[PDB]
Amino acid sequence: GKKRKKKVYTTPKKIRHKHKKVKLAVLNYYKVDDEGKVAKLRKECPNCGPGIFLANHGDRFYCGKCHSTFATQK
């Protein structure tokens, strides 16, 4: 018993926050020492365990396996 008006929006748009398709982040993560030992880059996660690389933003290195656990200054 009612006809509905069209939902007109005074709101430009909000789009899905697209994830960034990173091309070969592991070369960014690692560093090869000429066919032998290999080093990692920028930290390793102590709260999560070995092998999980951390986040570089600024004045703080950040987790993301257990994201909220580790974001500490260094």
Partner RNA sequence: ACGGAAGGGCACCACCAGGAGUGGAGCCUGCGGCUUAAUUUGACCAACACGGGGAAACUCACCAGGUCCAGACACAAUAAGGAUUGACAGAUUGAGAGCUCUUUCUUGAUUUUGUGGGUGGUGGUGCAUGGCCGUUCUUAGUUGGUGGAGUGAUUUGUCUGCUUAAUUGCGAUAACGAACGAGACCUUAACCUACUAAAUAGGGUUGCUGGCACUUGCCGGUUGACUCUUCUUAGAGGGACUAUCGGUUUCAAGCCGAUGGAAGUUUGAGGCAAUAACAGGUCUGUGAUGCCCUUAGACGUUCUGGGCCGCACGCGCGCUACACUGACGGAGCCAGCGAGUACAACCUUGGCCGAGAGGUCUGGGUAAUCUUGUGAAACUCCGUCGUGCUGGGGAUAGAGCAUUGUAAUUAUUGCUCUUCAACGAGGAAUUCCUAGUAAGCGCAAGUCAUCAGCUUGCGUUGAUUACGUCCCUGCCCUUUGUACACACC
Residues in contact with Zn ion by the rule CB under 5 A:
45, 47-48, 63, 66, 69-70
- Residues in contact with 58: Cβ distance below 8 Å, sequence separation at least 6, in sequence order: none
- Alpha-carbon distance of 44 to 74, in angstroms, equals 12
- Alpha-carbon distance of 43 to 29, in angstroms, equals 9
Q: Binding marks (x or -) toward RNA, 39..68, rule CB under 7 A?
A: ---x---------xxxxxxx-x-xxxx-xx
Residues that bind RNA (CB under 7 A): 1-2, 4, 7, 9-25, 28-29, 42, 52-58, 60, 62-65, 67-68, 71
